[PDB]
Scaffold this active site. Sequence first.
Site, mmCIF file in Angstrom:
data_model
loop_
_atom_site.group_PDB
_atom_site.id
_atom_site.type_symbol
_atom_site.label_atom_id
_atom_site.label_comp_id
_atom_site.label_asym_id
_atom_site.label_seq_id
_atom_site.Cartn_x
_atom_site.Cartn_y
_atom_site.Cartn_z
ATOM 1 N N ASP A 52 0.794 -1.200 0.078
ATOM 2 C CA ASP A 52 0.087 0.231 -0.124
ATOM 3 C C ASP A 52 0.803 0.917 -0.155
ATOM 4 O OD1 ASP A 52 -1.227 -2.333 1.020
ATOM 5 O OD2 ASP A 52 -2.961 -1.258 1.932
ATOM 6 N N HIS A 54 -1.355 4.313 0.116
ATOM 7 C CA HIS A 54 -2.596 5.249 -0.106
ATOM 8 C C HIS A 54 -2.421 6.628 0.471
ATOM 9 C CE1 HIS A 54 -5.425 2.231 1.162
ATOM 10 N NE2 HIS A 54 -4.774 1.255 2.033
ATOM 11 N N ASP A 80 -4.104 -0.388 -3.527
ATOM 12 C CA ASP A 80 -4.238 0.421 -2.427
ATOM 13 C C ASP A 80 -3.466 1.696 -2.535
ATOM 14 O OD1 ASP A 80 -5.734 -0.952 -1.602
ATOM 15 O OD2 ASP A 80 -5.293 -0.042 1.095
ATOM 16 N N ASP A 83 -6.747 6.839 -1.041
ATOM 17 C CA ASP A 83 -7.527 7.173 0.718
ATOM 18 C C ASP A 83 -5.935 7.524 1.363
ATOM 19 O OD1 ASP A 83 -10.741 6.778 -0.304
ATOM 20 O OD2 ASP A 83 -10.131 4.644 -1.216
ATOM 21 N N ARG A 84 -6.869 7.845 2.079
ATOM 22 C CA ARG A 84 -6.415 8.432 3.698
ATOM 23 C C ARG A 84 -4.917 9.087 3.808
ATOM 24 N NH1 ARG A 84 -9.412 7.458 8.128
ATOM 25 N NH2 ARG A 84 -10.586 5.019 8.354
ATOM 26 N N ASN A 112 -8.333 -3.470 -2.442
ATOM 27 C CA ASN A 112 -9.443 -2.960 -2.354
ATOM 28 C C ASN A 112 -10.088 -1.468 -2.135
ATOM 29 O OD1 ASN A 112 -7.497 -2.732 0.517
ATOM 30 N ND2 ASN A 112 -9.516 -2.818 1.549
ATOM 31 N N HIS A 113 -9.345 -0.535 -2.379
ATOM 32 C CA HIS A 113 -9.487 0.967 -2.153
ATOM 33 C C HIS A 113 -9.891 1.226 -4.006
ATOM 34 C CE1 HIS A 113 -9.609 2.630 1.893
ATOM 35 N NE2 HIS A 113 -8.947 1.032 2.143
ATOM 36 N N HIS A 162 -3.237 -8.406 -3.158
ATOM 37 C CA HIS A 162 -3.928 -6.970 -2.369
ATOM 38 C C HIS A 162 -3.833 -8.298 -1.240
ATOM 39 C CE1 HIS A 162 -4.070 -3.683 -0.795
ATOM 40 N NE2 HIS A 162 -5.087 -4.033 0.282
ATOM 41 N N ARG A 209 -12.770 -7.247 9.168
ATOM 42 C CA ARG A 209 -12.763 -6.172 8.278
ATOM 43 C C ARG A 209 -14.633 -6.592 7.730
ATOM 44 N NH1 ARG A 209 -7.598 -4.146 5.848
ATOM 45 N NH2 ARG A 209 -6.622 -5.835 6.663
ATOM 46 N N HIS A 236 -2.251 -5.067 1.895
ATOM 47 C CA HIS A 236 -3.665 -5.014 2.677
ATOM 48 C C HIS A 236 -3.171 -4.544 3.791
ATOM 49 C CE1 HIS A 236 -7.881 -5.265 2.452
ATOM 50 N NE2 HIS A 236 -7.506 -6.259 3.683
HETATM 51 C C1 LIG Z 1 -11.983 -0.596 5.210
HETATM 52 C C2 LIG Z 1 -12.346 -0.815 6.267
HETATM 53 C C3 LIG Z 1 -11.522 -2.321 6.816
HETATM 54 O O1 LIG Z 1 -10.677 -2.701 5.977
HETATM 55 C C4 LIG Z 1 -11.421 -2.274 8.635
HETATM 56 O O2 LIG Z 1 -10.682 -3.559 8.550
HETATM 57 C C5 LIG Z 1 -10.945 -3.133 10.211
HETATM 58 C C6 LIG Z 1 -9.602 -4.272 10.979
HETATM 59 C C7 LIG Z 1 -8.966 -3.217 10.885
HETATM 60 C C8 LIG Z 1 -9.020 -2.150 10.059
HETATM 61 C C9 LIG Z 1 -8.155 -1.584 10.478
HETATM 62 C C10 LIG Z 1 -6.823 -1.098 10.470
HETATM 63 C C11 LIG Z 1 -6.037 -0.170 10.738
HETATM 64 C C12 LIG Z 1 -4.329 -0.149 10.521
HETATM 65 C C13 LIG Z 1 -6.182 1.605 10.900
HETATM 66 C C14 LIG Z 1 -5.557 2.448 11.791
HETATM 67 C C15 LIG Z 1 -6.137 3.707 10.952
HETATM 68 C C16 LIG Z 1 -5.012 4.930 11.562
HETATM 69 C C17 LIG Z 1 -7.610 3.499 11.086
HETATM 70 C C18 LIG Z 1 -8.437 2.772 10.676
HETATM 71 O O3 LIG Z 1 -8.842 2.932 9.461
HETATM 72 C C19 LIG Z 1 -9.469 1.690 8.690
HETATM 73 C C20 LIG Z 1 -10.071 1.954 6.973
HETATM 74 C C21 LIG Z 1 -9.188 1.957 6.527
HETATM 75 C C22 LIG Z 1 -8.961 2.030 5.128
HETATM 76 O O4 LIG Z 1 -7.614 3.007 6.698
HETATM 77 C C23 LIG Z 1 -7.630 1.010 6.523
HETATM 78 O O5 LIG Z 1 -6.398 0.456 7.187
HETATM 79 O O6 LIG Z 1 -8.605 -0.326 6.528
HETATM 80 C C24 LIG Z 1 -11.119 1.406 9.515
HETATM 81 C C25 LIG Z 1 -10.627 1.298 11.141
HETATM 82 C C26 LIG Z 1 -9.658 2.309 11.508
HETATM 83 O O7 LIG Z 1 -9.069 2.472 12.771
HETATM 84 O O8 LIG Z 1 -7.889 1.577 11.236
HETATM 85 O O9 LIG Z 1 -10.206 -2.072 10.920
HETATM 86 C C27 LIG Z 1 -12.031 -3.237 10.552
HETATM 87 C C28 LIG Z 1 -12.522 -2.355 10.147
HETATM 88 C C29 LIG Z 1 -12.808 -1.972 9.372
HETATM 89 O O10 LIG Z 1 -13.670 -0.949 8.943
HETATM 90 C C30 LIG Z 1 -13.607 -0.129 7.191
HETATM 91 C C31 LIG Z 1 -14.745 -1.324 7.356
HETATM 92 O O11 LIG Z 1 -16.075 -1.438 7.401
HETATM 93 C C32 LIG Z 1 -14.817 -0.963 5.161
HETATM 94 C C33 LIG Z 1 -16.245 -1.997 4.870
HETATM 95 C C34 LIG Z 1 -16.592 -3.848 4.852
HETATM 96 C C35 LIG Z 1 -17.108 -1.977 3.291
HETATM 97 O O12 LIG Z 1 -18.003 -3.296 3.039
HETATM 98 C C36 LIG Z 1 -17.597 -1.826 1.528
HETATM 99 C C37 LIG Z 1 -19.193 -3.189 0.745
HETATM 100 C C38 LIG Z 1 -19.045 -4.683 1.044
HETATM 101 C C39 LIG Z 1 -17.906 -5.531 0.819
HETATM 102 C C40 LIG Z 1 -16.666 -4.586 1.678
HETATM 103 O O13 LIG Z 1 -17.175 -3.305 0.652
HETATM 104 C C41 LIG Z 1 -17.526 -0.929 0.686
HETATM 105 C C42 LIG Z 1 -16.738 0.454 1.307
HETATM 106 C C43 LIG Z 1 -16.799 -0.286 2.686
HETATM 107 C C44 LIG Z 1 -17.579 0.013 3.607
HETATM 108 MN MN LIG Z 2 -6.433 -3.086 1.618
HETATM 109 MN MN LIG Z 3 -4.712 -1.060 2.853
#
Ligand SMILES: C=C1[C@@H](O)[C@@H]2O[C@]3(CC[C@H](/C=C/[C@@H](C)[C@@H]4CC(C)=C[C@@]5(O[C@H](C[C@@](C)(O)C(=O)O)CC[C@H]5O)O4)O3)CC[C@H]2O[C@@H]1[C@@H](O)C[C@H](C)[C@H]1O[C@@]2(CCCCO2)CC[C@H]1C
Ligand SMILES: [Mn+2]
Ligand SMILES: [Mn+2]
Lengths: 288, 581
Positions: A52, A54, A80, A83-84, A112-113, A162, A209, A236
């Site tokens: 990534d 990002h 990736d 985003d972010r 995924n992004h 990824h 996730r 990822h």
């Molecule tokens: C993105 C994510 C997942 O990856 C993320 O995974 C989890 C487990 C590990 C991950 C966190 C990793 C940390 C290192 C980072 C560090 C920091 C500082 C911020 C943060 O950042 C996360 C987003 C992102 C981008 O920064 C990332 O790190 O992933 C969100 C929580 C934040 O604390 O945690 O949190 C649980 C929450 C979950 O939240 C969203 C999730 O709801 C997204 C959702 C599942 C998706 O559904 C859809 C439709 C269904 C099919 C999939 O697409 C549409 C798009 C989207 C809504």
């Molecule tokens: Mn990813």
């Molecule tokens: Mn990522």
Amino acid sequence: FTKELDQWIEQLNECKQLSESQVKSLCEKAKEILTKESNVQEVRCPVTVCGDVHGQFHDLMELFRIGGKSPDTNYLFMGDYVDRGYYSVETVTLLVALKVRYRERITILRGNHESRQITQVYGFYDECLRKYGNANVWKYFTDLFDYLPLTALVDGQIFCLHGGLSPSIDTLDHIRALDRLQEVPHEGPMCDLLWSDPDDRGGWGISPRGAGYTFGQDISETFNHANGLTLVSRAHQLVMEGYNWCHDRNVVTIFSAPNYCYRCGNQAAIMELDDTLKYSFLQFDPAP
Amino acid sequence: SLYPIAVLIDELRNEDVQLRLNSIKKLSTIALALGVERTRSELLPFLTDTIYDEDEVLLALAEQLGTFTTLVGGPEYVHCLLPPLESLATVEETVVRDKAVESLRAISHEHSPSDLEAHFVPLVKRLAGGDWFTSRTSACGLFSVCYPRVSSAVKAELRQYFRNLCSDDTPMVRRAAASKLGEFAKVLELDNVKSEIIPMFSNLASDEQDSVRLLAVEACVNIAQLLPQEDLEALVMPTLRQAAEDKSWRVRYMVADKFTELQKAVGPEITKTDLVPAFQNLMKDCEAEVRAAASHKVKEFCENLSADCRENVIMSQILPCIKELVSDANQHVKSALASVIMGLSPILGKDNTIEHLLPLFLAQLKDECPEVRLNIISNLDCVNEVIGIRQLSQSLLPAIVELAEDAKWRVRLAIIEYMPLLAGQLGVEFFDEKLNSLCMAWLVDHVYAIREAATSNLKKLVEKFGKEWAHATIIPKVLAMSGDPNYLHRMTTLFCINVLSEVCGQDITTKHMLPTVLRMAGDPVANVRFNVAKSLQKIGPILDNSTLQSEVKPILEKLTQDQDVDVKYFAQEALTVLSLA
Ligand SMILES: C=C1[C@@H](O)[C@@H]2O[C@]3(CC[C@H](/C=C/[C@@H](C)[C@@H]4CC(C)=C[C@@]5(O[C@H](C[C@@](C)(O)C(=O)O)CC[C@H]5O)O4)O3)CC[C@H]2O[C@@H]1[C@@H](O)C[C@H](C)[C@H]1O[C@@]2(CCCCO2)CC[C@H]1C
Ligand SMILES: [Mn+2]
Ligand SMILES: [Mn+2]
């Protein structure tokens, strides 16, 4: 046209976006090139594999100071790009621009992004609005992302994607059979390849996730043996040390965004695969 | 107008009796049209008034007038030059005001003694006792040229007026009088330096305005040189000691600035008694400007201590303050100290340097501020010439080798700059035995930026040691990488050949590098192949035309047939730039 690409790249390297007009062109040809590539894109070493980025544009410039400049050093990015980070536009455009200019020096996978729903929740969409003035650049890029290969196989031994493994995919042929030309689905093989995470619990687990699955060592071992693979190289997941081995080294995670979100204080890594597939990792802090 | 003179006027613009510039410089020639008599009767008069501030013009007029004595009749008539000069002295833009005074001072010597009194002095007064202020800030610069030659009686008047100029109500007329008190002092007989100069000096040293006081420090250097050593303690030192203690850090700053000068003007004994403690205070001033200025003087000062008490005062009075400064908070200070601290080696000797200085040498060679370690690195010549190259190598090397290998590639990159410096300083025999290895190792570093830096670094080392040294000490080890299994290193080989052709000459490039480049045209990796096309393009101009036709053209032509898209592209570009297309 080539003299042009070169200029765009010189511009983007100063972190200056291209114009809507140009982006529309960069993308129409980028698609031409990416359409020909496969779901399991063949890549020959030597190559440097990255995770990534990002939109952390300045960290990408730092990555190049460490791995050499394109097209001198061959690169493989596992998705990736947006985003972010504060510069999703300059970052993804530079990489897509390096691809169109140098098809054989750069391989860009889909993360995924690189999708329509998630980019409207985490930055890309809005950064585009605030930098052009309408959603066009974002439509051009998200349409291009439909064409990004979901996977790359280096020298028929090192498999790169990824996310990770899917319960509905056991062979490289299964993947080649998928229609990747479309938005990332919420369920299924294609979704899984871009969302799953290696785990320390055996078998298949529920992903925290909300998409994809977690898979343990036993699943990696089976998938590696079944496919004549020496390793699964993915990204990822944030890895404090920049890179992380797991599953008795059948899997390695490579994360190229140091200090992710400018909050996590992680190192970044990039992985060099030499002429012989011997690997070595470069770790780095964010650019000053 | 009238034509002999009207040639000076510029009838084309829309000014106010303005003159043709590239014509005022051709002034000594209109003075020959009309002769001496007519030059005095109409050219000077015309130049006196008719003064439109075209400035660049006013300047040339004042300069030119300073070399016009003969065009006016010689000595006997030089005073005809005063009127327009007096004029230009009182202008505004000071550049002109200065040229006017410089010239006035020049022709003063042409005036005979009798003419000085009848015309020059009267001009000094009118300027001194003038109303406007500029007319006074310029008077100050004219007392020392006329004082020696006039009568005892006019000397007196000249003394009074200069005094009046020192206690002038305007500060500027005081700052100017202060900055010229020194030279005026050098031309008075001793009795009057003690009876008149000293009081003016004391007065200016205790001025309400500190911009006037800090100037008095300079004046002190001058007055102190003129006075016999025995008179210094009573007539000067109290004032000088007060200046080093002055409320205004500016005054103090000037003391540290003019320290070495004060040291010489005062003498070894007073330097031992009074200046050594003052110097110590200044090195501990609260203001970092003052500490830094003082630190800068450290070597010069210790060099001038009487060989007699020297070494014992340095070890006892100076060195402790120096250990302090090496750790000062402000980098401004550490900066000043490092740019001279090792210059103290030939003054303490091998043994002293080794036990007392080398430790401070290391404290700074591993300091925060890069300018600091760089100032230490830039001045190794002296310490090296005092202790042995081995004693130095033994105390510097571990520091270097420890930084060449490290955490951030950023710091490693910093140590690479020291190289061309170390080379040109410690010698080529030392570089080949202790440093060459390190420079070779970076070519194969993990971080690209380091490889890059190390590569361009080769060019800078050749500039230091020459093309022959390069062919026997660097080219071989650089070409050895052509056989490396990793393409990152193989490409590094060409990158080194690219930079080294810029400075190895046609011979060494053609015989010893070109082959390796041509040979890699068949590399298994495309990135090496196209960088081969790029390399020929780069080293191409350095090759004679015969070589480019029989050995390059063929290779590029082959590469244009290559399977890889980029090798084709770069091969074609190569052919086009070199004209082999
Ligand atoms: C993105 C994510 C997942 O990856 C993320 O995974 C989890 C487990 C590990 C991950 C966190 C990793 C940390 C290192 C980072 C560090 C920091 C500082 C911020 C943060 O950042 C996360 C987003 C992102 C981008 O920064 C990332 O790190 O992933 C969100 C929580 C934040 O604390 O945690 O949190 C649980 C929450 C979950 O939240 C969203 C999730 O709801 C997204 C959702 C599942 C998706 O559904 C859809 C439709 C269904 C099919 C999939 O697409 C549409 C798009 C989207 C809504
Ligand atoms: Mn990813
Ligand atoms: Mn990522």
